[PDB]
Design an enzyme around this catalytic site. Structure first.
Site, PDB file in Angstrom:
ATOM      1  N   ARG A 176       0.835  -1.317   0.069  1.00  0.00           N
ATOM      2  CA  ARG A 176       0.024  -0.031  -0.036  1.00  0.00           C
ATOM      3  C   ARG A 176       0.881   1.192   0.116  1.00  0.00           C
ATOM      4  O   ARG A 176       1.045   2.138   0.829  1.00  0.00           O
ATOM      5  CB  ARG A 176      -1.004   0.071   1.168  1.00  0.00           C
ATOM      6  CG  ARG A 176      -1.342   0.917   2.004  1.00  0.00           C
ATOM      7  CD  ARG A 176      -2.738   1.124   2.707  1.00  0.00           C
ATOM      8  NE  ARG A 176      -3.350   2.364   2.028  1.00  0.00           N
ATOM      9  CZ  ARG A 176      -4.632   2.563   1.323  1.00  0.00           C
ATOM     10  NH1 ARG A 176      -5.383   1.504   1.002  1.00  0.00           N
ATOM     11  NH2 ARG A 176      -4.917   3.879   1.216  1.00  0.00           N
ATOM     12  N   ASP A 241      -3.091  -9.403   0.718  1.00  0.00           N
ATOM     13  CA  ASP A 241      -4.119  -8.333  -0.238  1.00  0.00           C
ATOM     14  C   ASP A 241      -4.830  -9.185  -1.147  1.00  0.00           C
ATOM     15  O   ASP A 241      -5.870  -8.377  -1.488  1.00  0.00           O
ATOM     16  CB  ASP A 241      -3.174  -7.251  -0.890  1.00  0.00           C
ATOM     17  CG  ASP A 241      -2.818  -6.197  -0.151  1.00  0.00           C
ATOM     18  OD1 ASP A 241      -1.872  -5.595  -0.612  1.00  0.00           O
ATOM     19  OD2 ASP A 241      -3.205  -6.022   1.000  1.00  0.00           O
ATOM     20  N   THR A 242      -4.712 -10.091  -1.770  1.00  0.00           N
ATOM     21  CA  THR A 242      -5.194 -10.954  -2.606  1.00  0.00           C
ATOM     22  C   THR A 242      -6.827 -11.107  -2.080  1.00  0.00           C
ATOM     23  O   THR A 242      -7.940 -10.985  -2.456  1.00  0.00           O
ATOM     24  CB  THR A 242      -4.696 -12.437  -3.160  1.00  0.00           C
ATOM     25  OG1 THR A 242      -4.449 -12.964  -1.695  1.00  0.00           O
ATOM     26  CG2 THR A 242      -3.533 -12.135  -3.953  1.00  0.00           C
ATOM     27  N   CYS A 347      -1.678 -20.996  -7.958  1.00  0.00           N
ATOM     28  CA  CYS A 347      -1.627 -20.714  -6.668  1.00  0.00           C
ATOM     29  C   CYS A 347      -1.589 -22.089  -5.944  1.00  0.00           C
ATOM     30  O   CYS A 347      -2.643 -22.812  -6.000  1.00  0.00           O
ATOM     31  CB  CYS A 347      -2.995 -19.794  -6.409  1.00  0.00           C
ATOM     32  SG  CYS A 347      -3.186 -19.497  -4.571  1.00  0.00           S
ATOM     33  N   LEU A 348      -1.064 -22.077  -4.953  1.00  0.00           N
ATOM     34  CA  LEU A 348      -0.879 -22.944  -3.890  1.00  0.00           C
ATOM     35  C   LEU A 348      -1.852 -22.892  -2.836  1.00  0.00           C
ATOM     36  O   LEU A 348      -2.345 -23.922  -2.027  1.00  0.00           O
ATOM     37  CB  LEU A 348       0.637 -23.276  -3.263  1.00  0.00           C
ATOM     38  CG  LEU A 348       1.689 -23.846  -4.048  1.00  0.00           C
ATOM     39  CD1 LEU A 348       3.006 -23.692  -3.138  1.00  0.00           C
ATOM     40  CD2 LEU A 348       1.349 -25.260  -4.514  1.00  0.00           C
ATOM     41  N   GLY A 349      -2.194 -21.545  -2.548  1.00  0.00           N
ATOM     42  CA  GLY A 349      -3.031 -20.999  -1.547  1.00  0.00           C
ATOM     43  C   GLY A 349      -4.391 -21.174  -2.169  1.00  0.00           C
ATOM     44  O   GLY A 349      -5.296 -20.937  -1.257  1.00  0.00           O
TER      45      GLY A 349
HETATM   46  C1  HEM Z   1      -8.033 -14.829  -3.724  1.00  0.00           C
HETATM   47  C2  HEM Z   1      -6.913 -15.064  -3.381  1.00  0.00           C
HETATM   48  C3  HEM Z   1      -5.729 -15.357  -3.990  1.00  0.00           C
HETATM   49  C4  HEM Z   1      -5.441 -15.055  -5.439  1.00  0.00           C
HETATM   50  C5  HEM Z   1      -6.353 -14.420  -6.367  1.00  0.00           C
HETATM   51  C6  HEM Z   1      -4.142 -15.549  -5.647  1.00  0.00           C
HETATM   52  C7  HEM Z   1      -3.387 -15.523  -6.834  1.00  0.00           C
HETATM   53  C8  HEM Z   1      -2.169 -16.195  -7.107  1.00  0.00           C
HETATM   54  C9  HEM Z   1      -1.535 -15.989  -8.615  1.00  0.00           C
HETATM   55  C10 HEM Z   1      -2.226 -15.242  -9.786  1.00  0.00           C
HETATM   56  C11 HEM Z   1      -0.466 -17.011  -8.485  1.00  0.00           C
HETATM   57  C12 HEM Z   1       0.632 -16.944  -9.443  1.00  0.00           C
HETATM   58  C13 HEM Z   1       1.604 -16.045  -9.504  1.00  0.00           C
HETATM   59  C14 HEM Z   1       2.629 -16.226 -10.695  1.00  0.00           C
HETATM   60  O1  HEM Z   1       2.270 -17.044 -11.629  1.00  0.00           O
HETATM   61  O2  HEM Z   1       3.540 -15.200 -11.158  1.00  0.00           O
HETATM   62  C15 HEM Z   1      -0.408 -17.361  -6.981  1.00  0.00           C
HETATM   63  C16 HEM Z   1       0.718 -18.109  -6.448  1.00  0.00           C
HETATM   64  C17 HEM Z   1       0.719 -18.516  -5.071  1.00  0.00           C
HETATM   65  N1  HEM Z   1      -0.027 -18.033  -4.216  1.00  0.00           N
HETATM   66 FE1  HEM Z   1      -1.833 -17.377  -4.338  1.00  0.00          FE
HETATM   67  N2  HEM Z   1      -3.560 -15.895  -4.392  1.00  0.00           N
HETATM   68  C18 HEM Z   1      -4.668 -16.042  -3.627  1.00  0.00           C
HETATM   69  C19 HEM Z   1      -4.491 -16.557  -2.228  1.00  0.00           C
HETATM   70  C20 HEM Z   1      -3.167 -16.906  -1.608  1.00  0.00           C
HETATM   71  C21 HEM Z   1      -3.349 -17.816  -0.338  1.00  0.00           C
HETATM   72  C22 HEM Z   1      -4.383 -17.624   0.680  1.00  0.00           C
HETATM   73  C23 HEM Z   1      -1.920 -17.794  -0.208  1.00  0.00           C
HETATM   74  C24 HEM Z   1      -1.151 -18.477   1.135  1.00  0.00           C
HETATM   75  C25 HEM Z   1      -0.164 -18.234   1.753  1.00  0.00           C
HETATM   76  C26 HEM Z   1      -1.247 -18.000  -1.413  1.00  0.00           C
HETATM   77  C27 HEM Z   1       0.004 -18.437  -1.776  1.00  0.00           C
HETATM   78  C28 HEM Z   1       0.671 -18.538  -2.920  1.00  0.00           C
HETATM   79  C29 HEM Z   1       1.854 -19.045  -3.378  1.00  0.00           C
HETATM   80  C30 HEM Z   1       2.729 -19.610  -2.493  1.00  0.00           C
HETATM   81  C31 HEM Z   1       2.167 -18.896  -4.684  1.00  0.00           C
HETATM   82  C32 HEM Z   1       3.287 -19.215  -5.298  1.00  0.00           C
HETATM   83  C33 HEM Z   1       3.353 -20.484  -6.117  1.00  0.00           C
HETATM   84  C34 HEM Z   1       4.521 -20.997  -6.838  1.00  0.00           C
HETATM   85  O3  HEM Z   1       5.239 -19.717  -7.269  1.00  0.00           O
HETATM   86  O4  HEM Z   1       4.907 -21.903  -7.077  1.00  0.00           O
HETATM   87  N3  HEM Z   1      -2.302 -17.319  -2.440  1.00  0.00           N
HETATM   88  N4  HEM Z   1      -1.300 -16.703  -6.255  1.00  0.00           N
HETATM   89  C1  LIG Z   2       2.071   6.275  -6.779  1.00  0.00           C
HETATM   90  N1  LIG Z   2       2.941   5.381  -6.007  1.00  0.00           N
HETATM   91  C2  LIG Z   2       2.311   5.189  -4.491  1.00  0.00           C
HETATM   92  C3  LIG Z   2       3.296   4.171  -6.387  1.00  0.00           C
HETATM   93  C4  LIG Z   2       2.739   3.424  -7.526  1.00  0.00           C
HETATM   94  C5  LIG Z   2       3.052   2.267  -7.981  1.00  0.00           C
HETATM   95  C6  LIG Z   2       4.107   1.442  -7.637  1.00  0.00           C
HETATM   96  C7  LIG Z   2       4.914   2.075  -6.689  1.00  0.00           C
HETATM   97  C8  LIG Z   2       5.872   1.365  -6.123  1.00  0.00           C
HETATM   98  S1  LIG Z   2       6.712  -0.097  -6.706  1.00  0.00           S
HETATM   99  O1  LIG Z   2       6.770   0.175  -8.181  1.00  0.00           O
HETATM  100  O2  LIG Z   2       7.978  -0.401  -6.304  1.00  0.00           O
HETATM  101  N2  LIG Z   2       5.643  -1.352  -6.140  1.00  0.00           N
HETATM  102  C9  LIG Z   2       5.034  -1.745  -7.521  1.00  0.00           C
HETATM  103  C10 LIG Z   2       5.110  -3.529  -6.917  1.00  0.00           C
HETATM  104  C11 LIG Z   2       4.608  -3.674  -5.444  1.00  0.00           C
HETATM  105  C12 LIG Z   2       4.787  -5.159  -5.534  1.00  0.00           C
HETATM  106  C13 LIG Z   2       3.821  -5.783  -4.475  1.00  0.00           C
HETATM  107  C14 LIG Z   2       3.727  -7.326  -4.493  1.00  0.00           C
HETATM  108  C15 LIG Z   2       4.682  -7.779  -3.491  1.00  0.00           C
HETATM  109  C16 LIG Z   2       3.863  -9.005  -2.412  1.00  0.00           C
HETATM  110  N3  LIG Z   2       2.887  -9.917  -3.454  1.00  0.00           N
HETATM  111  C17 LIG Z   2       3.460 -10.782  -4.260  1.00  0.00           C
HETATM  112  O3  LIG Z   2       4.484 -11.318  -4.100  1.00  0.00           O
HETATM  113  C18 LIG Z   2       2.413 -11.728  -5.040  1.00  0.00           C
HETATM  114  C19 LIG Z   2       3.002 -12.720  -5.792  1.00  0.00           C
HETATM  115  C20 LIG Z   2       1.967 -13.621  -6.539  1.00  0.00           C
HETATM  116  C21 LIG Z   2       1.254 -12.622  -7.674  1.00  0.00           C
HETATM  117  C22 LIG Z   2       0.489 -11.295  -6.678  1.00  0.00           C
HETATM  118  C23 LIG Z   2      -0.372 -12.175  -5.876  1.00  0.00           C
HETATM  119  C24 LIG Z   2       0.271 -13.276  -4.683  1.00  0.00           C
HETATM  120  C25 LIG Z   2       1.185 -14.337  -5.545  1.00  0.00           C
HETATM  121  C26 LIG Z   2       1.525 -12.357  -4.008  1.00  0.00           C
HETATM  122  C27 LIG Z   2       1.566 -10.561  -5.822  1.00  0.00           C
HETATM  123  C28 LIG Z   2       6.872   2.108  -5.167  1.00  0.00           C
HETATM  124  C29 LIG Z   2       6.401   3.268  -4.476  1.00  0.00           C
HETATM  125  C30 LIG Z   2       5.373   3.690  -4.875  1.00  0.00           C
HETATM  126  C31 LIG Z   2       4.535   3.240  -6.094  1.00  0.00           C
END
Ligand code: HEM
Ligand SMILES: CN(C)c1cccc2c(S(=O)(=O)NCCCCCCCCNC(=O)[C@]34C[C@H]5C[C@H](C[C@H](C5)C3)C4)cccc12
Ligand SMILES: [K+]
Length: 404
Positions: A176, A241-242, A347-349
């Site tokens: 955020r 955040d998802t 997604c594993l989650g």
């Molecule tokens: C509505 C909920 C969720 C959404 C839409 C979501 C979506 C995704 C997506 C799109 C990916 C694949 C990202 C990639 O290909 O780059 C991902 C990966 C993964 N997410 Fe979720 N996620 C959700 C909830 C969660 C939860 C509850 C967990 C639990 C900690 C979780 C754990 C992970 C993990 C560990 C992976 C990485 C798998 C790997 O890289 O092989 N997710 N998720």
């Molecule tokens: C105008 N201002 C406010 C700004 C605007 C825009 C960018 C800004 C940046 S920025 O450009 O540095 N930040 C943009 C990217 C932020 C990454 C967040 C994802 C990390 C955690 N989630 C995952 O790993 C996952 C990995 C995977 C995919 C997806 C869901 C799950 C699974 C968790 C994400 C820095 C500072 C300010 C900015």
């Protein structure tokens, strides 16, 4: 607008800004769906955010997620500097090294874990909702959607409840952002919290997720401390955040659609199907990949090092795969989406996430069947890697509710 690279043809340029798309006021899925208008090609280049490709149709999105050899996860975010700094495991790794790290992560957030946590998920939902029920109002995002997944994570990770507001502070700084710190700094601050815990649980493991990951074996040897940290950062942020934002989208929709609330009240057996159709319609993730080599894809020359945005969000909104895609039909047949991604990183989650969604729908409508958006409030969405809802003020008449 970054200078257009000479390998990119002008007829493919479409300057979509994933962090501030035009028409965001129409809704964020609607704003992204501009990419699917008839005059926009299947694969476009935007000069925003440093410049990158965007695949706009489900067929190309799935194809690229399948082809990890060309489309690598080593730099999966836009802009490039964030994707470069990002090093969570397994999301910043490609197979084959990714596979054993993914198997280890599966042991702690995969399906069977769900059955062990299910009673606590049920209790947490009910306790949160009963706390709100007599009040006749809440800010759903703040009062339910944020506390629910982080409390579940603290349980699976064996972390104390009092740590929640600090962890929240730390993840907000990352996800955020307000431009006060860079992604790299926010990431390091998060690592600072995890590193001592992993040290502790490598000496004295318990049965929580961190102990299991930190003491695991991968491709024949013990996981290192650093690998453990990089995995734990993802297990923390992955389902925060998802889930927060998805629940918020879902509840905004239900608050605006009394007929769909009544549908699930009268036919509770449709709640799993409703969960899937909301996951389709209110899909919210957009990450991507980097080209490992020059590659022609669907008649377009891609260059080594180019970034490509592969919005998970868009596949289920594609009219070529789901008729009337902006319409929500809990009886929709052949629901297709890539909301949880596609391919090796699927997604594993997802089983935990669906449990959280289904429990919320059932337990919310059980106690608070009738609710609305607060009169006068303008719901605002936000766009980025995980799109969302800024706030969701809801109201109801407590006399219509029931404690259960
Ligand atoms: C509505 C909920 C969720 C959404 C839409 C979501 C979506 C995704 C997506 C799109 C990916 C694949 C990202 C990639 O290909 O780059 C991902 C990966 C993964 N997410 Fe979720 N996620 C959700 C909830 C969660 C939860 C509850 C967990 C639990 C900690 C979780 C754990 C992970 C993990 C560990 C992976 C990485 C798998 C790997 O890289 O092989 N997710 N998720
Ligand atoms: C105008 N201002 C406010 C700004 C605007 C825009 C960018 C800004 C940046 S920025 O450009 O540095 N930040 C943009 C990217 C932020 C990454 C967040 C994802 C990390 C955690 N989630 C995952 O790993 C996952 C990995 C995977 C995919 C997806 C869901 C799950 C699974 C968790 C994400 C820095 C500072 C300010 C900015
Ligand atoms: K990286």
């Amino acid at each position: 607008l970054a200078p257009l690279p000479p390998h990119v043809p002008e007829h493919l340029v479409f300057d979509f800004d994933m962090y501030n798309p035009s028409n965001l006021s129409a809704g964020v899925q609607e704003a992204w769906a501009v990419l699917q208008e008839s005059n926009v090609p299947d694969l476009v280049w935007t000069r925003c955010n440093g410049g990158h490709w965007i695949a706009t149709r489900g067929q190309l999105i799935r194809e690229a997620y399948e082809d990890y050899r060309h489309f690598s996860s080593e730099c999966p975010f836009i802009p490039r500097e964030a994707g470069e700094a990002y090093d969570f495991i397994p999301t910043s790794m490609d197979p084959p090294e990714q596979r054993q790290f993914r198997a280890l992560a599966n042991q702690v957030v995969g399906m069977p874990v769900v059955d062990k946590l299910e009673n606590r998920i049920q209790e947490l939902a009910c306790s949160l909702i009963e706390s709100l029920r007599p009040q006749g109002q809440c800010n759903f995002t703040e009062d339910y959607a944020e506390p629910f997944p982080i409390r579940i994570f603290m349980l699976l990770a064996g972390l104390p409840e009092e740590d929640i507001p600090h962890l929240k502070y730390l993840t907000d700084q990352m996800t955020r952002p307000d431009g006060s710190m860079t992604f790299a700094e926010a990431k390091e601050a998060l690592y600072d919290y995890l590193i001592p815990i992993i040290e502790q649980r490598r000496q004295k493991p318990g049965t929580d997720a961190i102990s299991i990951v930190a003491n695991g074996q991968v491709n024949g040897r013990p996981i290192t401390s650093d690998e453990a940290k990089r995995m734990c950062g993802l297990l923390l942020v992955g389902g925060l955040d998802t889930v927060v934002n998805f629940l918020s989208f879902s509840m905004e929709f239900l608050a605006k659609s009394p007929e769909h609330r009544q549908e699930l009240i009268e036919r509770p057996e449709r709640i799993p199907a409703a969960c899937e159709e909301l996951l389709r319609r209110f899909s919210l993730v957009a990450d991507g990949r980097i080209l490992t080599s020059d590659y022609e894809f669907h008649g377009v020359q891609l260059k080594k090092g180019d970034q490509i945005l592969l919005p998970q969000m868009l596949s289920g909104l594609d009219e070529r795969e789901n008729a009337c895609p902006m319409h929500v039909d809990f009886s929709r047949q052949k629901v297709s989406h890539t909301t949880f991604g596609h391919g090796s990183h699927l997604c594993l989650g997802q089983h935990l996430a669906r449990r959280e969604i289904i429990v919320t729908l059932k337990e919310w409508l059980t106690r608070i069947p009738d609710f609305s958006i607060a009169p006068g409030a303008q719901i605002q969405h936000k766009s980025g890697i995980v799109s969302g809802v800024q706030a969701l003020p809801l109201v109801w008449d407590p006399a219509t509710t029931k404690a259960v």
